[PDB]
Amino acid sequence: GSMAFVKSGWLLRQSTILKRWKKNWFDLWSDGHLIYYDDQTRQNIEDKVHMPMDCINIRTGQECRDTQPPDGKSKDCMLQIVCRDGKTISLCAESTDDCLAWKFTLQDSRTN
Structure with a gap:
């Protein structure tokens, strides 16, 4: 099996x-x-999403629905993973560039 990740890092997530x-x-x-x-520390697993099978869209910025950023932060820091069962995972990166890096990586993960 795999011994290394595509990408790892912090994101803020809106809780359920x-x-x-x-x-x-996050580890991809x-x-x-x-x-x-x-x-x-990877001690307390919360959840997972399978990008190829579960994800039907990835929204960023103003596209994200029913979610507002933390106080003071631009909505361009946000990205939202849309799943086929209606689960949305609303995320907020540290920066607009962190957001784009994750968007492009997650989009590619769907077709990888």
């Missing part, structure tokens, strides 16, 4: 009960899975 923006650590696997954890 409280809808709070909270830090999570070469099998297509995006895994997110509470922190960068």
Whole structure:
């Protein structure tokens, strides 16, 4: 199996009960899975999404629906993974460039 990731890093994610923006650590696997954890120790797995099978769209910026950025931050930092079962994963990068780097990586993961 794989011993190394396509991309890893922090993103803020809007939570599924409280809808709070909270830090999570993300690993994108070469099998297509995006895994997110509470922190960068990889101890507390939260959830996953299989980009090829589950994702039907990736939105960024003003495209993102039903989600507003953390206070003070441009919505151009945001990206939203849209899944076929209606799950949306609303994300906020540190910068607009971090957002684009993830967008392009996640788009490619769908077709990889």
